Design an enzyme around this catalytic site. Structure first.
Site, PDB file in Angstrom:
ATOM      1  N   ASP B  25     158.153 -48.257  57.197  1.00  0.00           N
ATOM      2  CA  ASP B  25     159.313 -47.541  57.535  1.00  0.00           C
ATOM      3  C   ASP B  25     160.649 -48.067  56.787  1.00  0.00           C
ATOM      4  OD1 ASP B  25     161.105 -45.820  58.636  1.00  0.00           O
ATOM      5  OD2 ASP B  25     160.675 -46.209  60.762  1.00  0.00           O
ATOM      6  N   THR B  26     160.805 -47.661  55.906  1.00  0.00           N
ATOM      7  CA  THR B  26     162.222 -48.118  55.268  1.00  0.00           C
ATOM      8  C   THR B  26     163.360 -47.768  56.034  1.00  0.00           C
ATOM      9  OG1 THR B  26     162.278 -46.231  54.007  1.00  0.00           O
ATOM     10  CG2 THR B  26     161.017 -47.979  52.939  1.00  0.00           C
ATOM     11  N   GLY B  27     163.264 -46.784  56.925  1.00  0.00           N
ATOM     12  CA  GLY B  27     164.322 -46.618  57.885  1.00  0.00           C
ATOM     13  C   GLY B  27     164.546 -47.440  59.169  1.00  0.00           C
TER      14      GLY B  27
HETATM   15  C1  LIG Z   1     167.526 -42.211  63.059  1.00  0.00           C
HETATM   16  C2  LIG Z   1     167.562 -43.737  62.914  1.00  0.00           C
HETATM   17  C3  LIG Z   1     167.111 -44.271  61.589  1.00  0.00           C
HETATM   18  C4  LIG Z   1     165.789 -43.842  61.298  1.00  0.00           C
HETATM   19  C5  LIG Z   1     164.612 -44.202  62.157  1.00  0.00           C
HETATM   20  C6  LIG Z   1     163.203 -43.839  61.550  1.00  0.00           C
HETATM   21  N1  LIG Z   1     161.904 -44.265  62.349  1.00  0.00           N
HETATM   22  C7  LIG Z   1     161.013 -43.192  62.328  1.00  0.00           C
HETATM   23  C8  LIG Z   1     159.581 -44.266  63.204  1.00  0.00           C
HETATM   24  C9  LIG Z   1     158.480 -43.210  63.523  1.00  0.00           C
HETATM   25  C10 LIG Z   1     158.246 -42.784  64.924  1.00  0.00           C
HETATM   26  C11 LIG Z   1     158.494 -43.508  65.991  1.00  0.00           C
HETATM   27  C12 LIG Z   1     161.415 -42.156  63.050  1.00  0.00           C
HETATM   28  O1  LIG Z   1     161.856 -41.784  63.988  1.00  0.00           O
HETATM   29  N2  LIG Z   1     160.505 -41.070  62.279  1.00  0.00           N
HETATM   30  C13 LIG Z   1     160.808 -39.689  62.879  1.00  0.00           C
HETATM   31  C14 LIG Z   1     162.204 -39.157  62.230  1.00  0.00           C
HETATM   32  C15 LIG Z   1     162.321 -37.639  62.616  1.00  0.00           C
HETATM   33  C16 LIG Z   1     161.436 -36.464  61.741  1.00  0.00           C
HETATM   34  N3  LIG Z   1     161.115 -35.455  62.231  1.00  0.00           N
HETATM   35  O2  LIG Z   1     161.149 -36.708  60.569  1.00  0.00           O
HETATM   36  C17 LIG Z   1     159.559 -38.945  62.661  1.00  0.00           C
HETATM   37  O3  LIG Z   1     158.782 -38.832  61.755  1.00  0.00           O
HETATM   38  N4  LIG Z   1     159.239 -38.085  63.843  1.00  0.00           N
HETATM   39  C18 LIG Z   1     157.975 -37.103  63.733  1.00  0.00           C
HETATM   40  C19 LIG Z   1     157.090 -37.798  64.798  1.00  0.00           C
HETATM   41  C20 LIG Z   1     156.695 -39.402  64.444  1.00  0.00           C
HETATM   42  C21 LIG Z   1     156.014 -39.693  65.869  1.00  0.00           C
HETATM   43  N5  LIG Z   1     154.632 -40.241  65.636  1.00  0.00           N
HETATM   44  C22 LIG Z   1     153.768 -39.659  66.045  1.00  0.00           C
HETATM   45  N6  LIG Z   1     153.774 -38.603  66.914  1.00  0.00           N
HETATM   46  N7  LIG Z   1     152.343 -40.089  65.647  1.00  0.00           N
HETATM   47  C23 LIG Z   1     158.427 -35.999  63.827  1.00  0.00           C
HETATM   48  N8  LIG Z   1     157.697 -35.025  63.161  1.00  0.00           N
HETATM   49  O4  LIG Z   1     159.124 -35.549  64.728  1.00  0.00           O
HETATM   50  N9  LIG Z   1     164.768 -45.843  62.435  1.00  0.00           N
HETATM   51  C24 LIG Z   1     164.518 -46.095  63.757  1.00  0.00           C
HETATM   52  O5  LIG Z   1     164.122 -45.520  64.631  1.00  0.00           O
HETATM   53  C25 LIG Z   1     164.476 -47.760  64.114  1.00  0.00           C
HETATM   54  N10 LIG Z   1     166.162 -47.657  64.350  1.00  0.00           N
HETATM   55  C26 LIG Z   1     166.873 -48.682  63.431  1.00  0.00           C
HETATM   56  O6  LIG Z   1     166.327 -49.126  62.473  1.00  0.00           O
HETATM   57  C27 LIG Z   1     168.249 -48.932  63.884  1.00  0.00           C
HETATM   58  N11 LIG Z   1     168.879 -48.283  64.972  1.00  0.00           N
HETATM   59  C28 LIG Z   1     169.561 -46.827  64.956  1.00  0.00           C
HETATM   60  C29 LIG Z   1     170.192 -46.600  66.092  1.00  0.00           C
HETATM   61  O7  LIG Z   1     170.084 -46.770  63.644  1.00  0.00           O
HETATM   62  C30 LIG Z   1     168.469 -50.284  64.152  1.00  0.00           C
HETATM   63  C31 LIG Z   1     170.111 -50.850  64.385  1.00  0.00           C
HETATM   64  O8  LIG Z   1     167.864 -50.897  65.260  1.00  0.00           O
HETATM   65  C32 LIG Z   1     163.759 -48.329  65.266  1.00  0.00           C
HETATM   66  C33 LIG Z   1     162.379 -48.001  64.570  1.00  0.00           C
HETATM   67  C34 LIG Z   1     164.092 -49.652  65.511  1.00  0.00           C
HETATM   68  C35 LIG Z   1     163.982 -50.535  64.447  1.00  0.00           C
END
Ligand SMILES: CCCC[C@@H](CN[C@@H](CCCC)C(=O)N[C@@H](CCC(N)=O)C(=O)N[C@@H](CCCNC(N)=[NH2+])C(N)=O)NC(=O)[C@@H](NC(=O)[C@@H](NC(C)=O)[C@@H](C)O)[C@@H](C)CC
Lengths: 99, 99
Positions: B25-27
């Site tokens: 996860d590059t994010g």
């Molecule tokens: C918005 C904030 C930046 C991007 C985000 C991407 N992380 C992924 C992680 C995967 C799931 C836990 C994410 O949210 N992905 C979502 C984005 C929304 C989207 N629709 O694409 C995703 O794919 N969501 C899928 C569900 C994935 C869950 N997995 C699963 N059901 N198996 C979805 N379709 O809704 N990063 C983060 O959430 C990270 N946050 C950060 O890196 C920073 N925090 C902030 C607030 O920017 C740092 C200051 O802590 C977390 C992990 C802590 C290190």
């Protein structure tokens, strides 16, 4: 380009005629932009992240230019902490991870 | 190796000697694993993203092997639907985004 990961991979995008900054996010299925208007219709959707679920507006077939590369696809709009470009558009612009 | 983004970039990691699947996860700034039985000293932290914040345990200097490439650093443990490899470790294995 080739982008290393010492810093957040933030780039400038063009969407709806406006410039925005967004994070290239391989961990995102979808592309999620901060609250704004976009042309056309939308439907409600919910998506989840590290902290749980949020409500978004789903817009389909939106052109987005990402660091000079064109994509056209779904853009979700809602209260994300950061604009993110997810795999639905990263695949269109040919992005890979390499190590 | 090259990983395309058609599917979630899930790869095998080794942490505490055992194999798990994790998302590159590059994010993500940090690495978040759901392994609540690690031995070791930890400190409380909060981390956030879409949906808000969760409480995690911060462990330092933990070896994590990613696709056979060794890394060592901070691992955050807490309730997450998917194990996340973030930039703190991606940088150690030489990972880049390319398009
Ligand atoms: C918005 C904030 C930046 C991007 C985000 C991407 N992380 C992924 C992680 C995967 C799931 C836990 C994410 O949210 N992905 C979502 C984005 C929304 C989207 N629709 O694409 C995703 O794919 N969501 C899928 C569900 C994935 C869950 N997995 C699963 N059901 N198996 C979805 N379709 O809704 N990063 C983060 O959430 C990270 N946050 C950060 O890196 C920073 N925090 C902030 C607030 O920017 C740092 C200051 O802590 C977390 C992990 C802590 C290190």
């Amino acid at each position: 380009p080739q982008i290393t990961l010492w810093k957040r991979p933030l780039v400038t995008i063009r969407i709806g005629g406006q410039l925005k900054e967004a994070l290239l996010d391989t961990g995102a299925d979808d592309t999620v932009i901060e609250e704004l208007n976009l042309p056309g219709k939308w439907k409600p959707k919910l998506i989840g992240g590290i902290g749980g679920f949020i409500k978004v507006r789903q817009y389909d077939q939106i052109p987005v230019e990402i660091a000079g590369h064109k994509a056209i696809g779904t853009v979700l709009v809602g209260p994300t902490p950061v604009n993110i470009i997810g795999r639905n558009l990263l695949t269109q612009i040919g992005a890979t991870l390499n190590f």
